[PDB]
Each structure stands twice: as structure tokens, then as C-alpha cells.
A paper describes a structure:
The tumor suppressor p53 acts as a DNA sequence-specific transcription factor regulating and activating the expression of a range of target genes in response to genotoxic stress. This in turn initiates a cascade of signal transduction pathways leading to different cellular responses including cell-cycle arrest and apoptosis that are known to prevent cancer development (1–4). p53 binds as a tetramer to specific response elements consisting mainly of two decameric half-sites separated by a variable number of base pairs. The majority of tumor-related p53 mutations, particularly those defined as mutational ‘hotspots’, occur within the DNA-binding core domain of p53 (10). R273, a DNA-contact amino acid, is one of the most frequently altered residues in human cancer (6.4% of all somatic mutations), with mutations to histidine (46.6%) and to cysteine (39.1%) being most common.
Replacing serine by arginine at position 240 (S240R) was also found to rescue R273H. The crystal structures provide high-resolution information on various R273-related mutants including the oncogenic single mutants: R273H and R273C, the rescued double mutants: R273H/T284R, R273C/T284R, R273H/S240R and R273C/S240R, and their complexes with DNA. A superposition of the mutant structures onto one of the wt core domain structures shows that their 3D structures are similar to that of the wt protein, demonstrating that mutations located at the protein surface have a negligible effect on the structure of the protein. Similar geometrical features of the protein surfaces are displayed by the crystal structures of the single mutants: R273H and R273C, and of the double mutants: R273H/S240R, R273H/T284 and R273C/T284R in the absence of DNA. The mutation sites of these proteins are compared with the corresponding region of the wt p53-DNA complex by modeling the central A/T doublet as shown in Supplementary Figure S4, confirming again the inability of His or Cys residues at position 273 to interact with the DNA target. The arginine side chains of the second-site mutations in these structures (T284R and S240R) display a range of conformations in their free state, but a single conformation is observed in their DNA-bound state. Reactivation of these proteins is achieved by new interactions formed by the second-site mutations, T284R or S240R, with the DNA backbone.
Numbering used by the authors: 94 to 290
Amino acid sequence: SSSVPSQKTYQGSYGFRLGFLHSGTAKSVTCTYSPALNKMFCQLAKTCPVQLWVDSTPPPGTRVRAMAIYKQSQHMTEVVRRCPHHERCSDSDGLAPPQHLIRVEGNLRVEYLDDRNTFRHSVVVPYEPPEVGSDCTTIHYNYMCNRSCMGGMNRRPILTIITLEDSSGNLLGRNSFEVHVCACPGRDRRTEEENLR
Ligand SMILES: [Zn+2]
């Protein structure tokens, strides 16, 4: 058996889009997003801000789900999970399953799912509208393995799929971005952009 979650962009009725801080590539940055590569460069277990931008307010009870998938075609059917080492280092925050790559930081309403049919992991929070004078909603994700992990991702590129779903789980919108968890995001981003013709 196997299945592959859709990664098709779907802005949907509420005009759902993702946004990221314009953080630059100084060596000290804790994370940084490349618009040219649609790629977020971030660090193990550290804050990774992702912004939700909507054009109109979704219904009450809307939820925001994050799920990782392998980028390379030949690995798409493989569930992305933490490496054995990090799983064993028993470092759950008391909410997150130790096998889950993606956590949410700073939200006590976070919910984690092991899908009993597809075996995929995901993390979901209630959708909240922006604060007054803010134009987006920010979620702090943490990625709990990097590209230096042996086993688990094992150096392979991944994407995060962000889904807006209603209270009944129906699809309202979907977006995605590549994630590269590394030691020095600023350096990795600048280097990877240096190639661009
Ligand atoms: Zn790991």
C-alpha cells in the first residue's frame, strides 16, 4: 500500500497564500526564506515563522494543518519522520509525538495526528485571524531533524504542505514550500542562490 498527499496549490475561496519574513542571509539569521527557490532555510528545533495570508475570513472552526513530504519523485510515497536518534533522545514537549518531524511552538491548542490509514504525520492548530493592524497570521513551526541526520530524512529534500480546512476537515486551501533544515541558514541560502543564472 501507498498514498501521496496532494501538494497542488489551491488558493481557494478565501484567497489563501503563504508569506515569510524578509530576513536576509546574514550568518546569524535563525531562518530565512528564498523567494527564488520557494525554500525556507531553518535550524533544528528553532522557531520557523510561516505567515498565512487570506483575502476573506474563513468560517468559524477553520484549522491549519502542516505535513511534510519528500520532494524527489521516487520518495514521495515514503512517510517523512524523525530519524531514530532524535526519536530516541526523548525530547517531546509533552504534546508532540517523538516521531513527528514538524511541531508547533507556542500554541497550547496544537493537535497531532498519526493517520491510521495513510500513516502520515501532521500537526494542526485552530486558524486565528491576524491581530488588528496585522495583515497575516503567523505560526511558529519547529523542524525536529536536520539534513545532517542519519536515517529519517537522510539528506533528502522535503516540502511542507500547509492546508486550510474547515471544522469538518473539508479542503479550503493549500500551499507548499520546500524546507531545508541546516546549521547555518544564511550561508546555505546565499550559496544556493549564488548559482542562479
Ligand atoms: Zn534527526
